[PDB]
Design a protein around this motif. Structure first.
Motif, short mmCIF file in Angstrom:
data_model
loop_
_atom_site.label_atom_id
_atom_site.label_comp_id
_atom_site.label_asym_id
_atom_site.label_seq_id
_atom_site.Cartn_x
_atom_site.Cartn_y
_atom_site.Cartn_z
N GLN A 279 2.06 1.43 -3.74
CA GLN A 279 1.06 1.61 -4.79
C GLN A 279 0.16 2.78 -4.58
N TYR A 280 -0.02 3.22 -3.33
CA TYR A 280 -0.95 4.27 -3.03
C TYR A 280 -0.30 5.35 -2.24
N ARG B 78 -4.50 4.76 3.99
CA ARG B 78 -5.16 3.58 3.35
C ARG B 78 -4.84 2.30 4.15
N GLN C 214 -2.35 8.17 -0.58
CA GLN C 214 -3.46 7.82 0.33
C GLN C 214 -2.80 7.30 1.60
N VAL D 151 0.85 -1.17 0.00
CA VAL D 151 0.00 0.00 0.00
C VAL D 151 0.88 1.23 0.00
#
Length: 207
Positions: free
Chosen positions: A152-153, A159, A156, A149
């Motif tokens: 990839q994010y 997240r 965010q 996470v």
């Protein structure tokens, strides 16, 4: 692993590869539910570490968690949810929010497979023989998820914690409601937790 970051990545790829699907007579909603359950058990037989646990530990983990894996797979697969425009609907309504919240966070395939591993490797199961090892496996799964996470994010930042906060709600979903909603024609009667061990010992592929 011994490049930790790349071996946590290889783990997630193996959790993914374990999924039976991508994951004439058109499945009905209950055939769809049976596939979501069977696919959970088949996925568990094919991930790293789980199949090497003592069989009784494997059974203990799935007996506790099958309903949480069921919910994860139902959200993942967009199992049709208000469906019989026949049904209850306190039952229909309480399965529903959990599915809707996971879809609302746009949980991806990787994140699903991690969450299912985190759910399966729970030291809350009764009767475990090697609690430390299972905890270690849950730690690996969460550490894998966190890394995914963050990479990839990256915009965010909350997240990871949002995905983990789906877990307590999974743990409150009632097994009996899921059974009543989807499994009565297939099983009666009989609590899924009592049939899990037969399921695990059935079930196909060499892969």
């Amino acid at each position: 692993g011994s490049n930790s970051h790349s071996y946590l990545s290889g783990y997630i790829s193996l959790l993914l590869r374990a999924e039976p699907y991508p994951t004439m007579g058109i499945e009905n909603i209950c055939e769809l539910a049976a596939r979501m359950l069977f696919s959970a058990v088949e996925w568990a037989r094919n991930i790293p570490f789980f199949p090497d646990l003592q069989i009784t530990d494997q059974v203990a983990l799935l007996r506790l968690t099958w309903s949480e894996l069921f919910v994860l797979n139902a959200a993942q697969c967009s199992m049709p949810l208000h469906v019989a425009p026949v049904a209850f609907m306190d039952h229909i309504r309480i399965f529903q929010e959990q599915v809707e919240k996971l879809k609302a966070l746009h949980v991806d395939s990787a994140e699903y497979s991690c969450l299912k591993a985190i759910v399966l490797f729970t030291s809350d199961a009764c009767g475990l023989s090697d609690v430390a090892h299972v905890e270690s496996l849950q730690e690996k799964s969460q550490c894998a998820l966190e890394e995914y996470v963050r990479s990839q994010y990256p915009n965010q930042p909350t997240r990871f914690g949002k995905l983990l906060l789906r877990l307590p709600s999974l743990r409150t979903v009632s097994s009996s409601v899921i059974e009543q909603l989807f499994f009565v024609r297939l099983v009666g009667k009989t609590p899924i937790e009592t049939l899990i061990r037969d399921m695990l010992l059935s079930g196909s592929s060499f892969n």
